[PDB]
Design an enzyme around this catalytic site. Structure first.
Site, mmCIF file in Angstrom:
data_model
loop_
_atom_site.group_PDB
_atom_site.id
_atom_site.type_symbol
_atom_site.label_atom_id
_atom_site.label_comp_id
_atom_site.label_asym_id
_atom_site.label_seq_id
_atom_site.Cartn_x
_atom_site.Cartn_y
_atom_site.Cartn_z
ATOM 1 N N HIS B 91 62.941 66.151 23.554
ATOM 2 C CA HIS B 91 64.202 66.700 24.283
ATOM 3 C C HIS B 91 64.005 66.899 25.509
ATOM 4 O O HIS B 91 62.840 66.963 26.154
ATOM 5 C CB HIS B 91 64.529 68.006 23.437
ATOM 6 C CG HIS B 91 64.739 67.916 22.113
ATOM 7 N ND1 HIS B 91 65.964 66.936 21.544
ATOM 8 C CD2 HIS B 91 64.377 68.529 20.788
ATOM 9 C CE1 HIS B 91 65.834 67.327 20.181
ATOM 10 N NE2 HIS B 91 65.047 68.327 20.046
ATOM 11 N N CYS B 133 66.669 63.092 26.908
ATOM 12 C CA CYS B 133 68.009 63.107 27.605
ATOM 13 C C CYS B 133 67.713 63.931 29.103
ATOM 14 O O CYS B 133 66.708 64.591 29.318
ATOM 15 C CB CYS B 133 68.854 64.264 26.890
ATOM 16 S SG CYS B 133 69.110 63.957 25.222
#
Lengths: 158, 143, 92, 92, 143, 158
Positions: B91, B133
């Site tokens: 992430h 991301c």
């Protein structure tokens, strides 16, 4: 011809197809362009019964692929304990070194397979083996937080 | 391919490739499981090994573990290696990547390999592949 | 004679700054899928920027998100390569 | 079939983020000097990333700052190329 | 050079190349003259023209002028052009460039050319060359 | 041979060297690989006396380089008013269009040379000329904040 079929079937864990291919004369030591043999494939994917059949047809237990890996390397890395024992019983080199100097003991110590570490040690694995980077299986166990394995390796060294 | 313009690859080994495979995260981060990341890690292991790298994968690393691994790697002797690669699967948000327990700035991870701090990789390529991301914007695309 | 301490890095990001990066739960991230595909075929033949440009196009063209939430449906992605390299890189 | 709206940009920065970019008062900026030099010789022959990589090396190797202020003496520079391109670019 | 992997360059013209040449700045900015920038602009004019661009240079632009020029360019018809280039020569800080009278975010300048906002440049390369500081850090180098 | 020497001398504004080179048979219409002639060079750099000598040796006043630019283009862009007048007196095409459709009037309007704009207009310059982008000299004057020129062009149009 039968070679790719054999590799594919062995990889996919299709016992009967493998037995049929072998009974029909497939090369037990067939390999892809990277030196990957059906015995490697079955060792990595954990297909015990297929390993048995291949060995029965005289599979090279110490076949080395393009990267210096043997089926014992594959089994130790993937963590398949019963296959590790079977390979050793058929003369697998417990201290085989790949192109970067990794031994099966390095792989087991890094991946955290304590029982495989024990079995390798009992079969003569070199606790002091340095890979190309100068690291022992103990170093790898420490780097990856595998404390119980690190303790076993440290005790075995002396 | 005029050799004066290519990195020298006549070394004993291509080099190390470190993969950080973060799938499971501490409940405090509020981040979900990254289903599919193991397929990524295994795909990358096979393809980077094919190139000639010594690939080593570490799973679900804390921020401290990521920092120590890269720091360690930067302190190893790469004299006889042509280059270095590191792949981060996690992430992320802008400029940061998630460890199992929180966020760490990506620049802190790459800093260890700076030319003055990692002499045995001086004049050699240092490659970072980052799957994470970098914010929450979406690209609606255009036909 | 000196070299910059910031020289010879390359960063291959899956997406551009500020943007989400897409991952299929069953198949893996779009970026890794494309990267492995391109490497498998061309990794020993092409220069690193050639490889990464082909990855950019594969991700840009072959992938589009699916969702029952309209906000997340039919979205696209482009990766982002940052090069401070001083020579061409072949994995020869 | 769609394309990302962020696709097909390239940014050729004279320097990396956070860093100064050097300019000779008499000759021009290091980055432009190198860029024009490389373009003049190879601009119609090489792909854009080949050109910009050669610029990276020229700036990295051929230039070093001079100053009577020690703080500004003997400093170096590397440019920074950000590519979202999806194909190879030749100025043919 | 396998054509499937190159941008199509079979267009009537290569395209526009805009150069913003900021040398003199308003006293309020506290920024000094950029001696040498005219040599840069003239060098770039000659070399970008050589490539086949229609090069146009604008000197000492305010932030508003820079914004309007790029916005205008994005609204012109590039159907028969292969690509677009813009070169910015100025003072800068991280993520911003100086107009004659202050700072403007670089992203605001490039935004006009986004695929959904500039249809006649869709699938065509959009090139930005940026000569400007991005901060005050210095690279001490290493031997 | 003498050609490069001539171009170099003309570029560097060396009147006597140019006169010597011409008197010794140098090709007045010599050009580099980009079609740049000594008359172009002297027009851009503003060397009036050299322009005069070149024309006296029969320099092509309308020589077009690789980009479609003529010496009148060069003089209008660089802003050399007296050279603009001299070129026109020797038959320079006031409306010559380069490869992107720029005329000398476009160049003068963009660069802000009001007197050159006046001279071009008086010599028949086409106020309505569109370059390849569909822009007139008026458009360029507006884009670049050259208001007095824009006013002159707008009045000349009708």
């Amino acid at each position: 011809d039968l070679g790719k079929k054999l590799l594919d079937a062995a990889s996919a864990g299709q016992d009967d197809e493998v037995r049929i291919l072998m009974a029909n004369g497939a090369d037990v030591n067939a390999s892809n362009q990277q030196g990957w043999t059906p015995l490697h494939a079955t060792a990595e994917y954990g297909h015990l019964e297929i390993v048995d059949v291949l060995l029965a047809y005289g599979a090279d237990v110490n076949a080395s692929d393009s990267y210096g890996s043997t089926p014992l390397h594959s089994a130790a890395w993937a963590g398949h304990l019963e296959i590790v024992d079977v390979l050793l019983a058929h003369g697998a080199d417990v201290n085989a070194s790949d192109n970067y100097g990794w031994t099966p003991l390095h792989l087991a110590a890094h991946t955290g397979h304590l029982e495989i570490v024990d079995v390798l040690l009992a079969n003569g694995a070199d606790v002091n083996a340095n890979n190309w980077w100068g690291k022992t299986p103990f170093d790898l166990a420490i780097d990856n937080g595998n404390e119980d394995i690190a303790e076993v390796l440290q005790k075995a060294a002396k | 391919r005029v050799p004066t313009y290519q990195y020298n690859m006549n070394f004993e080994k291509l080099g190390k490739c470190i993969i950080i495979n973060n799938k499971n995260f501490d409940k405090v981060t509020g981040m979900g499981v990254r289903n599919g990341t193991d397929k990524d890690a295994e795909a990358l292991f096979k393809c980077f090994r094919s190139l000639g790298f010594d690939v080593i994968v570490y799973n679900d690393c804390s921020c401290a573990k990521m920092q120590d691994l890269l720091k360690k790697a930067s302190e190893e002797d790469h004299t006889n290696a042509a280059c270095f690669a590191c792949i981060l699967l996690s992430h992320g948000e802008e400029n940061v990547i998630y460890g199992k327990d929180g966020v760490t700035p990506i620049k802190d991870l790459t800093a260890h390999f700076r030319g003055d701090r990692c002499k045995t990789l001086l004049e050699k390529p240092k490659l970072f592949f980052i799957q994470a991301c970098r914010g929450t914007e979406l690209d609606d695309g255009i036909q | 004679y000196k070299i910059p301490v910031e020289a010879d890095f390359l960063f291959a990001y899956s997406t551009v700054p500020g943007y989400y990066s897409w991952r299929s739960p069953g198949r893996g991230s779009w970026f890794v899928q494309a990267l492995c595909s391109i490497l498998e075929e061309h990794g020993k033949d092409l220069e690193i920027m050639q490889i990464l440009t082909r990855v950019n196009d594969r991700v840009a063209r072959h992938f589009e998100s699916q969702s029952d939430d309209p906000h997340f449906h039919e979205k696209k992605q482009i990766p982002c390569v940052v090069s401070m390299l001083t020579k061409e890189l072949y994995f020869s």
